[PDB]
Structures are given as structure tokens and as C-alpha cells.
Assembly symmetry: D2
Homo-oligomer: 163 residues x 4
């Protein structure tokens, strides 16, 4: 079924959304620790009215649940020599969600799935391993859980349309 934004509207590809914690403000790039400048992790900002850095969603126009999608940050400046597409840092113990993925490659494929009770609330899952969060340098950073795909340690998200 279609993924819906905060207005209950269906999500469209090539359209800007803030990924907002459903559970501080939105999701933003920050470095994961002082050993890795590039590429960037994804942190929940502690500043309450910051909407997040907007993303666009691509499919390898509707965005459906349980389908392969790629998440790419939308930004006019990007100091790192790699892509704005989300992916998994394999090398790290933490399994941080990091930038620099290939939007066309399977390394960057996440699936949007329903989370708990409330409507328009979702989780990101990788194929079932769900996206959660861990304490890091700049705050909670998105990570891949070890998980059998439950909502226990999953980081719940909403999609707010950027106007």
C-alpha cells in the first residue's frame, strides 16, 4: 500500500520530504565520530524546530510500502566527495546509516514499512533488519539493528512534505 505523508497524502518520488522522528527536530547529516569526517551519518537534531535536511525518494510516481526505494538528501552544498544517498556502513561495528551510496545499486535499498498503532508512522527496513538509533558524537545516529523486524528498537519516522 502507498506510503503517506503527515497530511495523509500519498508519497511521490522526486518530491522533497523532511524525514521527521515520529517518536528535538528532524534528521540531518553529521559525522558519526571524530575518526570519520566523510561520509556523513544521519542524526536527530536536538534543536526542536529544525525540520531536518530534506530528502527525495527514488524507486529503481507513487512510493509504496514493502518496495525497494533509495533515500537521497537534497542540499545546495555538499563538502564530502561522495553522494547524498543513504546506505549502510558495513565496515563499522555500529552499522551506521551513512551517505555516499549508489541510488541505482542494491546497497542503498531500504523498504518503508508500517510502525505500531498510529497512522502515517513508518520504519525503515533493510533486506528483515530495521533501522534504529545509537548514541553518537552529535546525538542519536541512525543504525541498522540486528533485528527480526519488530518495532521494538526501530526508529519510527514520519514524512513531512517540504512546502
Amino acid at each position: 500500500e502507498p506510503v503517506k505523508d503527515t497530511n495523509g497524502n500519498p508519497l511521490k518520488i522526486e518530491t522533497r520530504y523532511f524525514i521527521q522522528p515520529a517518536s528535538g527536530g528532524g534528521l540531518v547529516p553529521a559525522n558519526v565520530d571524530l575518526s570519520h569526517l566523510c561520509p556523513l551519518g544521519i542524526v536527530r537534531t536536538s534543536l526542536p524546530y529544525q525540520p531536518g535536511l530534506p530528502v527525495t525518494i527514488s524507486t529503481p510516481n507513487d512510493v509504496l510500502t514493502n518496495t525497494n526505494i533509495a533515500i537521497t538528501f537534497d542540499a545546495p552544498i555538499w563538502p564530502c566527495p561522495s553522494s547524498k544517498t543513504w546506505t549502510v556502513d558495513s565496515s563499522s561495528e555500529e552499522k551506521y546509516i551513512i551517505t555516499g551510496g549508489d541510488p541505482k545499486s542494491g546497497e542503498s535499498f531500504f523498504r518503508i514499512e508500517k510502525y505500531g498503532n498510529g497512522k502515517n508512522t513508518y520504519k525503515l527496513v533493510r533486506y528483515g533488519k530495521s533501522v534504529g538509533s545509537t548514541k553518537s558524537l552529535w546525538g542519536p545516529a541512525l543504525v541498522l539493528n540486528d533485528d527480526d523486524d519488530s518495532d521494538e528498537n526501530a526508529f519510527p519516522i514520519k514524512f513531512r512534505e517540504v512546502d
Copy 2:
């Protein structure tokens, strides 16, 4: 003239209420250091990232906020790494006359006046007693400065929801 300052919704501005100060003329106004010689206190820059609303401010009077009256602007943030206040003030020592943080909200050094600006309703300028607030190129982008006397930096007040 002493009429109420209005937000983007045409509603009258209230004290102790959060507003983004948005350029009326990139996103909102945010703290950043003015240059690589001064870490604290902070200047006020227009962010180049288009959907960033700014860091919210609250307005205080030494509940309505009126034009041509003494007010103090104070940033609202849960964390503040500099050892000084979130209240806007003028950096006297600098040639540029940067608007900086660390002022005393109760002291006259921090008093600005909100006045009507040129084109369009709900558009304002900040003036200090007449010396208006403009902008200059700096490290992180346009930084708010005090002018000498066209060059005013027009602003709107958006209510934080």
C-alpha cells in the same frame, strides 16, 4: 507611530512567544561565528539552506509588541556552548558593527526598535537608537550589522508551531 507588529499570519506579535525571524527579501536567521578570530559570542547569519526556518527568538519589553518601542531579541535554544546570553546586541569594538549574542535583555545596549519597511505588509526592519540593521558578507554568509544611517535588512516574523 506605535502600532502592533504583526507576524506572517497578520496576527499581532506577543512577548515570550517563539518566532523565526525570516528574511523578507536561503532560509532564516541563525547563530554563526563572524570570523575565524572570534568564536564567542556569535553573529547572526542568513542560512543558505532553503528550508531551514532559522533559530527561533523570543521578544521581550523592558503582552503586545509595538512598532517604534524598545524591545530585546533573545535566541531560544536548549544548548548554548558560549559562556554568554542568547540576547542580541551590537559589537561596538568591531569596525563592521556586527549584531552579536551575549547582550543584557534588561540593559539599553540590547534595545532595538521594530519599524515598518517599504514594500508589503508584515515586513519590518530593526533600528537602533536612527541606525538600521543591514547585512554584510562574512565567513558563513550574510551577517547582520548596524548601518551608519536602502541598506536595511527586511524581516518578517513567522510564528513557530
Copy 3:
């Protein structure tokens, strides 16, 4: 009350530049203590091995003697924080970080240089001694409670 000696066994002089080098990575340098405090600055051991530290000058309220009141002040051509380069204790913090911005003439900034353990020319800063704690940029100097002292040497800047 005997003279403090540098790495060359020479007596320490006031108004003379020294690197404070860990006796136990490189020298001691200003860094912020955590992401909540930009200014003033803490004192961290750099992890880069050939960095000598930021030089300090020592003042007395020309010889620098052990067990006497001295003030340690960083020597740098640029200083972005709006406070002094003089070491002092951050009372407000739980960690009791040694921070910059003290008054060199005030007692808040007085440390005493005392002998440490075995080796010659090895000292500690003090009956509460200066130790170290894990922080943002590495080991940061702290005041210990009431073994854990951070041993130091003074290298003359040439």
C-alpha cells in the same frame, strides 16, 4: 622549595616559553571539553605524536620553585575565545576540568608544581592534584578528589 627543572635539567624561568609535555601522543593543547562548551577551553593531550603542545609561560604572584604558588598561561598569537589564556579550575563542572580564562593575579589560578614518582625532571600540578579524564578530543586535564596524578615535564621552546 627547590627549583623546578626543564627536560635539560636547567632551572625553570618565569616569562619563558615551555611546552608542558606528558611525562608518561604529543604535548598539551587547548581544545573544547565537550559539545556543550566552546569557550573557555580545556587542556587536552594531542594524539599526534610530534606536536610539541601549545607553549606556556609561568608567572609568580626569575626562578620557578616547587611547592610555590604559580600561574600557567598559554602563549599564542591568536585567541578566539573572549577570555584569558591562564589556566584555572572549572568549579561548575562535575569533572573539575582545568580550563582557560583564569586571572593570573588571582588565587583561583594558583597551582603548585611538585615532584612526581621515580624519574628526574618529572612533576605534577597540585592537596588536590591534576589528573586526566576521557573527553571529546582525548585525555583532558582535571582536578582529582581530596596514583591518579598526570605526570608532566617542561620542555624549553627553542
Copy 4:
């Protein structure tokens, strides 16, 4: 093709740590070139007077000779950028900044050490003739490719 000498008049050896010190503040260090580029890093002259620089090792594709192809590589126990510590030229930039992340075995990273005017043990870096100079940048003078920045090699103790 005579040997490059350090500040002690000793011949330079490969796989040996040297500070590259301005022959004309302190030594040469990594810093980002501007606020648009975090990685890879440029090479700036530190304004802090007693800082020796970040040490480098020199490799040849044990003596280091003038007018021969060499590669300069920073020596550090930590490196936050996802690329090499080997110096190279930023082609894409207008400024032609000397940046990190080159391949020490590839020709993109080859510089030549040549004698510089008057004083002994004073050298310049040249790329094949285009010499390495400096330009104003965010953190101070940054090394660039001209269309010369005199240097000395101090042995790390």
C-alpha cells in the same frame, strides 16, 4: 640529479619522516581549502609559530635526488577523510590546490624537488615546468600549482 639535503645538510632518505618547513608561522599541515570542501584536504602554512608541521615521508617510484619523480605522503596515526595521505593536484579547482588523496604509485602524485634561489638546503616543488606556490585561503596560505613556495626539509627527531 644531485641529492636533496635536509636542514642539517644531510642527504634525504626515503621512508623517513620530515617536516616540510617554509624556507621563507610554522610548518605545513592539512586543512580544508574552503567551506565547500571538507575532504580531501589542502596543505596550509600554520600561523602558530612553534608548530613543526605534519610530518611527511617521501617515496620514489634510499636517496632522494633533485629533478626526479617523487611522491609526498603525510604521516599521521589518524586520518578522518576516506582517501590517501599522498599529495596531488586538484585539477577540477580554478586555484589548482595541492590536496591529499593521490595515488603514490600513479603519475598524478609525482612532484620533483628542485633547488631554489641562493641559500643552501632550500628547495621548491615542481610538477611535470609548473612550480608549487601559495594562495590565500580559509586557514592561511595554501599550496597551489602555479601556471614558487620555497621549502626546507627538517628531520623529525
